[PDB]
C-alpha cells in the first residue's frame, strides 16, 4: 500500500499507517494500531509512503473467495498528531492510495463469471 499526499507543500504533521494480522479486532485507537506492524509517515518530509503487507497467513494458498470473515490484514492511517498548517492554506487536502501485488503473488484454479 502506497499513499501519495496531495497537500499544500507548506503544511506538516505526522500520520501512522498500520497493519493488523488476520483475526484481530479492528484496532480502533492509535494506541492499538501502534502495536501492529506500522510506519510513521511524515507528511512534511516525503509525500509518498509504501507499507508492504507481509504474507502472514495459515494455509499455503489464501482463499480469494467470499468467505464469512477471511483474514485478512488491516491497512489504516491514523492522526499521529494533528495537521499543521502554514499561513492560509485551504486546510483540507487529500491523499490517494495505490495497491499492487508482488513477484511472490500467485493464483490457481481458474474460476469465472460474466452475465
Amino acid at each position, epitope marked *: 500500500f502506497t499513499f501519495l499526499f496531495c497537500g499544500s507543500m507548506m503544511a506538516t504533521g505526522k500520520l501512522l499507517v498500520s497493519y493488523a494480522p488476520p483475526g484481530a*479486532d*479492528p484496532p*480502533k485507537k492509535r494506541k492499538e494500531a501502534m502495536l501492529g506492524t506500522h510506519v510513521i509517515w511524515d507528511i512534511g518530509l516525503q509525500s509518498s509512503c509504501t507499507m508492504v503487507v507481509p504474507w502472514i497467513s495459515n494455509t499455503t494458498y489464501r482463499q480469494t473467495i*467470499d468467505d*464469512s*470473515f477471511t483474514e485478512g490484514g*488491516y491497512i*489504516s492511517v491514523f492522526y499521529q498528531t494533528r495537521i499543521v498548517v502554514p499561513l492560509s492554506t485551504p486546510r483540507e487536502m487529500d491523499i490517494l492510495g495505490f495497491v499492487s501485488a508482488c513477484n511472490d503473488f500467485s493464483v490457481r484454479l481458474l474460476r469465472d463469471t460474466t452475465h
Partner: nanobody
Amino acid sequence: QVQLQESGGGSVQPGGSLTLSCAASGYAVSRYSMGWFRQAPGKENEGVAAIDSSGVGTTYADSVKGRFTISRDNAKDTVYLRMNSLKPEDTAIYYCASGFGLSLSRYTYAYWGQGTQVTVSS
C-alpha cells in the same frame, strides 16, 4: 453483496424523535457493525451515531451527544437508530452504512444505503 435497507425515515417535528433501522443481507450484521451519516443538503457527510455488534460500546458525534441514541439486535439482523430531541438543522439526508466498526469517519464503511430523508421542522 450486502444491501441493507434504511427504514424508519419520515418527516417529524422540532424537539421530536424518530426510530431508524437497517436489515442485513450478504452477511449477518453481527460481524461488521453499523452506523449513520446525515449529509445535510449541500454540505458534506456528517457523522451522528455508531455501535459495534459483537462488542457493544457506542460512539456519538458531539453535535448530537446525549440526546441521540443507537442500539443493536444481532438476532433480528437490524440496527436501531434512536434520534431524540430533533431540531431544524437535523433536517438532512440520513444514511446507514456498515464498517469497522463503530467509528464515525466519513467512510470506514462499506455498503451504504439509498438515503432516507427526515425533515424534522416540517
